[PDB]
Design a protein around this ligand. Structure first.
Ligand SMILES: CC(C)(COP(=O)(O)OP(=O)(O)OC[C@H]1O[C@@H](n2cnc3c(N)ncnc32)[C@H](O)[C@@H]1OP(=O)(O)O)[C@@H](O)C(=O)NCCC(=O)NCCS
Ligand SMILES: [Cl-]
Lengths: 548, 97, 276, 263
């Protein structure tokens, strides 16, 4: 295997001997970790650091911050999610310089600041599956810093309900002479104590028994107490004006209280329309605790999960018919495989957002705050490569016996006319435009493009954009449901009846929904506690949501 | 915080009274009493400053082509969105009938 | 002879849906809001009145000489052909959509089979609002295509819809059809048995009958009660297009003639044919 | 002689009838905030050629007469920079009920009225119907229901319907007692203006100090209202689509929608 053709293998080889003394086998000493990190990583390395929507490799993540900024500099950080503080710390300390991410958690006012100071450089804002894809083209990685639960001395890792992005972050690293380090909660000397092998040992280079269990974020869990009756009003319009009017059989729900509202009034408002089993049978969704009554009411046939919501593990093991579980009994999430399904195999996507302009362009990026896109761009677009027909997919066709006209994925943008802080949601210009000029961004960071949205859903009503004959007509429809926001003030009210009759928009009246019928009494579960007892004690909410 | 006053052409005095919501952050409280015939007098106390123009549009739309009963409406707003506000006004107006 | 008598093909002997299918070109008939849609009157059950599934009106698309058309037939059996909230909106909304077809290039014709007692008094104000919208849409449409009104009887055409009949370009009638504003009983009621007799059937037809209305110019065709002959006359009038100057815009000629008449005494069937 | 007549002189100034109009009509051009306005009203004429039309009824003459006055103003502003608005003061107890009337085609007379008003509305003329008294059946179809906007005075004398309870009870086969009974349970059957309002056919109701003869206070609120109503009309859709907003007309709206889906 010739020298000039195997240079990154000899480089991996050089790196593994500068820790051959410090490590016995694949096992690394917890209190000599930072030493190893300075030996296995080189300055300028492309590093994948597990900051997943949920699973965080917090021990590795912290130890890498207490590295010496003289030995490791100009690191290129590749993280699906930037939630933890240690993460952006790598940049102020001068250890890391470039960042390629997808989801920016709370860290959004920071990333923006650190960037404006010239400490952090951004490649672009991706959408998970896009960023994974890069790892075998543009951004082949050098080091992978991931996390699992258990590992044997051989290298086999059990990632369990928290598999998430690991199989996609590790594979392009292991097979390109890169270096894979996985922190685990426990090493077993006897391998038959590994409930399952999620990552084969031949992908892993070293394992570390962490100083404490890897941090799990309940990213998607929503307290049903915070669901107001305005949420419940939109939830009803979604179910009758969209799910039912198009016969949606499968879907994904974007994070947010708005879609939590939908999940929780299915077994009541959905039931009162005799829709149990007629819609929403298949899901590409995280195991949302707000979905529990819908499972028990017997609505949900299948659920394939991106990750796991902390506390839902035990509930899921007890529901093998619904979730995808291993032969060990526990969940096997797969954010790459779920994300893929959420694009190609699912009828609809529905999610919230922070801003929309008159053209329907949606984004989370606002003044000096670089929010992430998460999974929204992958599921918030009409998958142009899809060919397989489905009922809902076909309903979008204008002339249904034009054989050349293809169908469309339902892409719903579900938002109140106003963000709570008295800012309007529908604005004249996206903030994202100005953030682009001041970041040398080549094109404004839009999460979901206006031409991709089929339904705009508001407490005002539904705009069936998929029916728009021209852009001017689309803008007309958006303003009609846009309330008293600056976009909605463009709308001339005498024009509403026309738009209603023509079925361009639907008011709640048009759906047989009296607005004042929206109350929390429709919520199947009214609190986190009520969620625990639909689950019959199986859901163990994390301390954050407990009141007992 | 600021105090706003409104007035609209209305019909005959409404028939009863009504209370809807509470002054918690993000919600509002609406008092509906019967008032002087021909006039609908609204009084708004909001925690949001310079929203006056916003409340104006909300109300014009609410009463567009539908003449309301003559009422006295006392609103106490702790930064509720125009969506939530509109919703509680309708709850309130429904209960008055 | 006897074979002819045994072979009569009466038009009035058909119900609303039968008339509709019978006039519209063979095979084009497509009913909108059919009885299986179950779009019925929301005001009848509460009053202890049994509702009809299509509220007493048949609205159907199709062709009239390969020309796109819409047809609204009222069913006389149901509440006398009275229009209610839903009944009315089926007719008005159809004329409104025919008009919007003309504005988008499609030359849609509107054929109305009127067998009605006017506003359904059990839905009084909602049916009367509807007729106003029916009227409005008839005018709006006759800027592009004529509306042919067919009044064959038995019930005839009264109340608000007699005013809607007036608005129409052409008004084809049979002998049995009546066309008045107020029904005979209603006049007797308000004006006295001497001023008008609800039991005097030959008198009632003598003034408001299809024959009388045609001989005085308040009607454009005096059809026999034969299926084929009615379709024939229908197709023919749609083919003449919009009338040069229709009865509605003759306001001063009639005002002139009325001014001439000595109103001091009760005009008779013949007196009315002379005055025009 | 009638609320119509009282309110015509109070809004138009001219209380005498034009020459050329039947004595039962009252036409008069004027201005309303610098906008050209023609006031039309049907009033009583106890010396009407037809006896069955001497208490304000809309009969043969009143019918065609209206078709005259509107078509008159239609061709005037055929060219004018601003089509003049038509304000209909509605206060007509009924259609004329009679032999003389039916024999001469009273249904056709009132069709001339509807056609006129309608063609006017369609051309750009702003119609406004001011319900100051009674507004019944065919009479109101002719004089009033072609309006771009309806305004009623809030008052017990203001009633909308299609037949007197005497005749309605007869045709229907009910007692006057069960009508008034039913008229509370079925809003479209009721005569009062509150029940009419619930049909969302009125753009505005406004109460007054003295309905019989407006006070200077009334006449200013009414005049302001017409001004506002007239501005809502201008530049917008000319159809009667505005009459579909109410929950009691829920079905009217649903039918028009289903019609387009299957069209
Ligand atoms: C239409 C009319 C002339 C026909 O009378 P006819 O030929 O003698 O037939 P009938 O009197 O048997 O009428 C039959 C049915 O029509 C019904 N009907 C007629 N007009 C009706 C109306 N406007 N509302 C409700 N029902 C009506 C009658 O109640 C009767 O009911 P039934 O079928 O349960 O027996 C007569 O019903 C009439 O005078 N109608 C009044 C029309 C009118 O003036 N309209 C005012 C409202 S704008
Ligand atoms: Cl996800």
């Amino acid at each position: 295997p010739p020298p000039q053709w195997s240079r990154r293998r000899q480089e991996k080889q050089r790196r593994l001997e500068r820790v051959r003394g410090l490590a016995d086998g694949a096992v690394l000493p917890r209190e000599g970790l930072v030493a190893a990190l300075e030996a296995l990583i080189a300055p300028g390395d492309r590093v994948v650091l597990e900051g997943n929507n949920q699973k965080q490799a917090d021990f590795l993540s912290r130890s890498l911050a207490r590295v010496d900024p003289g030995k490791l500099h100009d690191l290129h950080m590749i993280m699906p999610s930037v939630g933890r503080p240690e993460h952006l710390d790598l940049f102020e300390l001068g250890i890391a310089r470039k960042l390629d991410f997808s989801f920016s958690g709370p860290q959004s006012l920071r990333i923006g600041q650190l960037l404006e100071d010239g400490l952090l450089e951004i490649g672009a804002i991706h959408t998970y599956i896009e960023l994974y894809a890069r790892l075998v083209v543009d951004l082949i990685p050098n080091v992978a810093l991931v996390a699992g639960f258990v590992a044997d001395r051989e290298g086999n890792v059990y990632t369990g309900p928290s598999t998430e992005d690991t199989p996609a972050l590790v594979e392009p690293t292991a097979f390109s002479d890169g270096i894979v380090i996985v922190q685990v909660n426990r090493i077993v000397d006897d391998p038959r104590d590994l409930p399952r092998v999620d990552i084969p040992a031949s992908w892993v280079d070293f394992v570390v028994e962490a100083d404490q269990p890897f941090y799990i974020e309940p990213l998607f869990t929503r307290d049903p107490r915070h669901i107001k009756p305005v949420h419940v009003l939109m939830a009803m319009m979604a179910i009758r004006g969209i799910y039912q009017r198009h016969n949606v059989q499968s879907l994904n729900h974007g994070i947010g209280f708005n879609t939590a509202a939908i999940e929780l009034i299915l077994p009541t408002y959905g039931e009162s329309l005799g829709l149990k089993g007629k819609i929403c049978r298949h899901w590409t969704l995280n195991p949302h605790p707000t979905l529990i009554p819908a499972i028990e009411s017997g609505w949900v046939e299948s659920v394939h999960c991106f990750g796991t919501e902390l506390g839902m593990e035990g509930y899921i093991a007890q529901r093998p018919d619904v979730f995808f579980t291993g032969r060990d009994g526990s969940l096997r999430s797969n954010r790459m495989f779920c994300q893929l399904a959420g694009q190609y195999a699912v009828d609809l996507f529905i999610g919230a957002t922070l801003q929309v302009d008159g053209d329907g362009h949606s984004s989370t990026v606002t003044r000096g705050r670089l929010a992430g896109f998460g999974g929204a761009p992958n599921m918030g677009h009409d998958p142009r490569g899809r060919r397989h027909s489905t009922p809902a997919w076909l309903d979008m066709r204008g002339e249904p016996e034009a054989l050349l006209e293809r169908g469309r994925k339902l892409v719903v943008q579900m938002v109140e006319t106003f963000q709570d802080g008295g800012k309007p949601t529908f604005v004249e210009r996206l903030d994202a435009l100005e953030v682009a000029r001041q970041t040398g961004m080549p094109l404004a960071p839009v999460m979901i493009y206006g031409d991709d949205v089929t339904h705009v859903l508001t407490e005002e009503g539904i705009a069936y954009l998929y029916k728009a004959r021209s852009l001017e007509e689309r803008q007309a429809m958006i303003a009609a449901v846009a309330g008293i926001s600056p976009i909605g003030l463009r709308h001339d009210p005498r024009e509403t009846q026309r738009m209603r009759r023509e079925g361009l928009i639907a008011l709640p009246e048009d759906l047989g929904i009296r607005r004042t019928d929206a109350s929390r009494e429709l919520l199947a579960a009214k609190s986190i506690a009520e969620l625990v007892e639909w689950s019959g004690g199986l859901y163990q909410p994390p301390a954050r949501f407990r009141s007992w | 915080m600021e105090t706003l006053s409104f007035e609209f052409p209305a019909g005959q005095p409404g028939r009863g009274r009504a209370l809807v919501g509470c002054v918690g952050s993000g919600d509002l409280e609406v008092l509906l009493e019967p008032g002087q015939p021909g006039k609908l007098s609204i009084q708004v106390q909001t925690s949001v400053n310079g929203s006056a123009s916003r409340w104006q549009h909300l109300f014009e739309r609410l009463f567009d082509g539908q003449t309301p009963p003559a009422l006295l409406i006392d609103i106490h707003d702790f930064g509720a969105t125009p969506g939530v506000v509109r919703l509680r006004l309708e709850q309130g107006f429904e209960e008055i009938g | 002879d006897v074979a002819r008598l045994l072979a009569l093909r009466s038009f009035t002997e058909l119900g609303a849906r039968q008339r509709a299918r019978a006039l519209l070109d063979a095979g084009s008939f497509r009913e909108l809001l059919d009885p299986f849609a179950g779009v019925q009157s929301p005001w009848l059950e509460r009053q202890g009145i049994v509702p009809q599934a299509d509220d007493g009106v048949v609205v159907a698309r199709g062709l009239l000489d390969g020309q796109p058309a819409v047809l609204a037939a009222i069913e006389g059996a149901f509440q006398g052909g009275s229009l209610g909230e839903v009944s009315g909106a089926k007719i008005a909304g159809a004329l409104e959509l025919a008009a919007e077809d003309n504005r988008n290039g499609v030359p849609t014709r509107a054929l109305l089979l009127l067998e009605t007692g006017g506003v359904r008094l059990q839905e009084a104000n909602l049916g009367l609002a509807a007729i106003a919208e029916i009227q409005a849409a008839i005018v709006d449409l006759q800027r592009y295509q004529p509306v042919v009104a067919v009044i064959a009887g038995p019930v005839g055409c009264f109340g608000g819809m007699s005013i809607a009949a007036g608005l129409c370009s052409y008004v084809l009638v049979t002998r049995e059809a009546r066309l008045g504003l107020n029904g005979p009983q209603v006049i007797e009621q308000e004006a006295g048995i001497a001023e008008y007799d609800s039991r005097d059937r030959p008198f009632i037809w003598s003034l408001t009958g299809g024959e009388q209305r045609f001989a005085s110019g308040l009607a454009d065709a005096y059809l026999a009660d034969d299926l084929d002959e009615v379709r024939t006359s229908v197709l023919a009038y749609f083919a003449k297009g919009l009338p040069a100057r229709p009865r509605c815009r003759r306001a001063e000629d009639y005002l002139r003639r009325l001014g001439d008449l000595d109103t001091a005494e009760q005009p008779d069937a013949a007196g009315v044919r002379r005055l025009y | 002689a009638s609320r119509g007549l009282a309110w015509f002189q109070a809004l138009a100034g001219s209380l005498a009838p034009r020459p050329g109009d039947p004595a039962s009509l009252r036409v008069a051009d004027a201005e309303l905030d610098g906008y050209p306005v023609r006031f039309l009203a049907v009033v009583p004429d106890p010396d009407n050629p037809f006896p069955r039309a001497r208490q304000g009824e809309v009969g043969l003459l009143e019918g065609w007469g209206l078709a005259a006055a509107v078509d008159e103003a239609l061709e005037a502003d055929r060219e004018a920079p601003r089509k003049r608005a038509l304000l209909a003061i509605v206060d007509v107890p009924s259609q004329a009920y009679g032999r003389r009337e039916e024999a001469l085609g009273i249904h056709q007379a009132l069709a001339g009225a509807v056609d006129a008003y309608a063609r006017a509305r369609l051309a750009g003329h702003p119609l406004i119907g001011l319900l100051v008294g009674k507004a019944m059946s065919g009479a109101f179809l002719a004089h009033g229901y072609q309006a771009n906007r309806l305004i009623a005075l809030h008052d017990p004398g203001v009633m909308v319907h299609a037949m007197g309870k005497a005749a309605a009870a007869r045709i229907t086969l009910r007692s006057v007692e069960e009508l008034e009974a039913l008229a509370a349970k079925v809003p479209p059957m009721a005569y009062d203006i509150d029940s009419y309002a619930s049909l969302g056919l009125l753009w505005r109701t406004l109460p007054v100090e003295t309905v019989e003869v407006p006070s200077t206070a009334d006449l200013v609120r009414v005049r302001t209202c017409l001004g506002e109503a007239l501005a809502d009309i201008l530049g917008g859709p000319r159809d009667l689509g505005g009459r579909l907003g109410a929950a009691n007309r829920e079905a009217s709206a649903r039918v028009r929608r289903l019609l387009r889906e299957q069209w």
